[PDB]
Amino acid sequence: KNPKSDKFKVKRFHHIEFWCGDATNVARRFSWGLGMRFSAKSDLSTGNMVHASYLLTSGDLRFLFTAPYSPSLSAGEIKPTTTASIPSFDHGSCRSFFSSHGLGVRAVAIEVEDAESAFSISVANGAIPSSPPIVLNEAVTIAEVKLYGDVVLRYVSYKAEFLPGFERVEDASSFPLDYGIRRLDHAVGNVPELGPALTYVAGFTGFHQFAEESGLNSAVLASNDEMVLLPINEPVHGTKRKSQIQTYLEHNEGAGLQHLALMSEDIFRTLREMRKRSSIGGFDFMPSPPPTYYQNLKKRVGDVLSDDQIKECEELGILVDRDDQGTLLQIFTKPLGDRPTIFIEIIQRVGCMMYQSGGCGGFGKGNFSELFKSIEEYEK
């Protein structure tokens, strides 16, 4: 069931913003690890005396990395005279965020028809305001409300490249890396209590619940066309194996973004390319399932994947799960930074063709049981 209850017109995920201590080093690491090209910048070289922001792109996926400069560089500015390109930025907020949580996502940004109306309707329906609508160069409107923890949901709307005040990156600095990643499929939050978090977010967005003891309960909120997908997890306590959600909440100092799932147009190429780079600056992957897991894929998805395609999943450590409508290929990185908090998921979905409908195949919750079963089976 999809009641299509969005309280304002939502388009697609627009970008994800990381708050960093040093944006340059995080962005360069991510660029090489994920195959994303440097596309835009806002920093001292573009007249921004407040923050350094670097944009990476792969297809429609946009990762923004932002860090504060010394406040002394902008001490004479006021908000009417700011040189910041992102008007919601605040030195103290950014330093406090990073000290509390470490490297992680500050903003989940969605493009909407009218960011001012989205903000007004959201706050009228219970959203906690974070940054009011600001019109940039009479061209783009940006507004922010609290999502969970210190993560904001950022609304962006365009009258008619990223944001005014950003400059396209010099091509010599813009190597055309591409490992096949094409868009953000979903963005997942960890919270102490799922119920109140769902009520709050669904309350101000009108997002509906998307149709679905390893230590979590989860639910998924979705926009009208189910292209914006926001799962939320809570821990399940006293499970004998400590909940990874609870570990997250401890090391993160509370609620925050758990993972970003990045859709690939060719998950086999993406994983070949990422795994080649894991130990030379890129990202590591979680330990692969035992071969019994792939010996059990024939009965589960033998009508979707050939033996060769299943063997290629086994070579790359890719997990497979299935809906009543489609099939999901997925794999998970180790944490992106020092803390056992945020990580990345690479996914590709097969089925649900009409274009492909959002969430085809689900989110892989079936792989909690199937991976445990494979592990005990391989114990043999």
Ligand X SMILES: C=CCN1CC(=O)N(C)c2ccc(C(=O)C3=C(O)CCCC3=O)c(C)c2C1=O
Q: Is 373 in the site for ligand X (CB under 6 A)?
A: no
CB atoms inside a 10 Å sphere around CB 12? 14
Which residue in 343, 57, 33 sits closest to 188, CA to CA? 343
| Minimal distance, residue 6 CB to ligand X, in Å | 20
Flag whether 315 is marked binding.
no
Q: Which is nearer to a second copy, 282 or 359 (CB)?
A: 282
Q: Would the annotation count 237 as a binding residue?
A: no
Length of the chain: 380
Q: Give, as ranges, the residues between 246 and 285 that touch ligand X (CB under 6 A).
A: 259, 261
Residue 195 Cβ, how far from ligand X at the closest point, in Å? Answer: 16
Element (H, E) at 4: none
- Spatial distance between the Cα atoms of 86 and 164, rounded to a whole number of angstroms: 9
Binding-site residue total for Co ion (CB under 5 A)? 3
CA distances from 216 to 194, 232, 239, 246, 284 (A): 10, 10, 10, 9, 24
Amino acid at 30: F
Q: Is 251 left (phi over 0), alpha (psi -120 to 50) or beta?
A: alpha
Q: Which does 286 bind (CB under 5 to 8 A by kind): Co ion, a second copy, ligand X, none?
A: ligand X
For residues 127 and 249, which CB has a smaller minimum distance to a second copy in the complex? Answer: 249
What sign for the dihedral angle of Cα 248, 209, 349, 325? positive
Please check if 14 is assigned to a binding site: no
* Binding of residue 261 to Co ion (CB under 5 A): yes
Q: Is 244 in the site for ligand X (CB under 6 A)?
A: yes
Interaction residues for Co ion, span 332-351 (CB under 5 A): 345
- What DSSP string runs through 133-179? EEEETTTEEEEEEEEETTEEEEEEEE----STT-EEPPGGG-----S
| CB nearer ligand X, residue 95 or residue 183 | 183
Tell whether the torsion through CA atoms of 146, 68, 15 and 348 is positive or negative. negative
Closest of 83, 78, 205 to residue 136, by C-alpha? 83
**Min dist. Cβ of residue 325 to ligand X (A):** 16
Q: Does 144 bind Co ion (CB under 5 A)?
A: no
242 is a contact residue toward ligand X (CB under 6 A): no
CA 225 to mean position of chain CA atoms: 19
Closest approach of Cβ 221 to ligand X, in Å?
11
Nearer to Co ion, 88 or 367 (CB): 367
Contact status, residue 264 vs residue 273, Cβ threshold 8 Å: no
Residue 368 interacting entry, from ligand X, Co ion, a second copy, none, C-beta within 5 to 8 Å by type: ligand X
Q: Is 218 in the site for ligand X (CB under 6 A)?
A: yes
The footprint of a second copy (CB under 8 A) covers 20-26, 28-33, 38, 43-44, 52, 67, 69-70, 72-73, 95, 98-100, 102-103, 172-175, 177, 250-251, 253, 279-282, 284, 336-340
- Residues 45, 365, 376, 378: which binds ligand X (CB under 6 A)? 365
Q: Residue 305: name the closest of 325, 289, 322 by CA.
A: 322
CB of 340 to a second copy, least distance (A): 7
Q: How far apart are CA 342 and CA 15, in angstroms?
A: 17
14 vs 186 by CB, closer to ligand X: 186
Please report how the helices 194-205 and 115-124 are oriented relative to each other, as an axis angle in degrees rounded to 10. 130
What is the C-alpha to C-alpha distance for residues 236 and 252, in angstroms, rounded to an integer? 17
Q: Does 286 bind ligand X (CB under 6 A)?
A: yes
233 touches ligand X by CB under 6 A: yes
Q: Which residues are annotated as a binding site for Fe cation?
A: 186, 259, 345
Query: Where on the chain is the footprint of Co ion (CB under 5 A)?
Result: 261, 345, 363
Annotated binding site: 186, 259, 345
